Design a protein around this ligand. Sequence first.
Ligand SMILES: O=C(O)c1c[nH]c2c(NCCS(=O)(=O)F)cccc2c1=O
Length: 442
Amino acid sequence: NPFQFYLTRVSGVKPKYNSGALHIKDILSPLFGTLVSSAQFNYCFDVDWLVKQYPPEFRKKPILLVHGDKREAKAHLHAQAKPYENISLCQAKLDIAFGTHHTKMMLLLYEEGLRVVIHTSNLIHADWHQKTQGIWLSPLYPRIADGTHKSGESPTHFKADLISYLMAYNAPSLKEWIDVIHKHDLSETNVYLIGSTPGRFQGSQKDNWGHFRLKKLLKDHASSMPNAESWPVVGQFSSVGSLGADESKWLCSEFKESMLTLGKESSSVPLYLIYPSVENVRTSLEGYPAGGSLPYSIQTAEKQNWLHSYFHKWSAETSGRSNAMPHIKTYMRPSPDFSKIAWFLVTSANLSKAAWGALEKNGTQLMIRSYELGVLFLPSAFGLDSFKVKQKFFAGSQEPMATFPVPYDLPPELYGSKDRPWIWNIPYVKAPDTHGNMWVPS
Ligand SMILES: O=C(O)c1c[nH]c2c(NCCS(=O)(=O)F)cccc2c1=O
């Protein structure tokens, strides 16, 4: 299949729904390459667990952990890694308040070449156990021969763009990986990189990151169609930031405006936001503990009740994952009848100004707090004008190269009048979950 978009394996669903899913043990398998060295970019790490996911024969190969922890949290991570002499750490600089290192990425250097994995899971058991998570697997990139001068660049500029993303860390351990990437041929890559890095971006640098990066790509490499105002926008996420006192402050002004962009010419566009309801969480495979990874706080939520009228339930019969709570984040542009999509993005970025960027300085500066990373699937990069939506995620479509595996159900279903968004720091004691328990936080 052209897209190489996968979900993680879910313990408890029928094998039909894990056939073609990937566990981390599969990604690190010798079948994928003979590992020489790896970098694991992430947010949360269980290092004992992580090393056990590598094949025994690869467990002493160098590992770089790229994280954002400071102070006591950083000390804890170093203490976790100290028993393993092959593990190095890179603390990503976070010089803007309330920023985090959320990017989930593996760089896998093999004897045979290089692989890049951009995904949505933390490196802890629970993130790969019963959650809906997304993975993009790069091709096996071969090495460029000694003395050969070629770019190794793709039509999507992915090689230079990934190097640019790494350069933003200004980190010596990552300069080594930049030099590795320089030595490999990434020309087969058919996705566009969409990253966020912390900073204040003006002028040309405005278009490098966050939602302005998405806007630039959609302007340059998608085409607008008639009735485009009728093509909805869908955002699907596991956490929500403080978006302001009403939709005009950020959500429908700059954010929706970037996501509505198509082509270079110049709103009624429906906006569907997908986020688990309390009932979604309660009846999930994990029960209420799934809400431990859906960190929407009551303090934030009570300031923006206007937002919840956009909320749609999690439903994923197409991939057998309605009870596997989402930690994947996705954004896409379906047709009015949801049979086609103009593009699809899988990313670590939740629905937050910190992740996507917020305009400052009279619209001249995009301020981003966090590191985020995703990949964008555009029909033009596959020789197509649109993608047909795959009807069943794990089935055999009549044209796999034209048919994109959307992992949850369309059309999204609006919350009912009795539904509420999952808010993780208030109690739920009216009905027990699938393990017989209530939710009593703090
Ligand atoms: O990007 C990610 O993978 C994630 C980032 N942060 C998370 C938090 N954040 C701390 C509470 S917070 O109120 O300070 F946001 C709690 C639970 C899960 C995640 C998570 O899964």
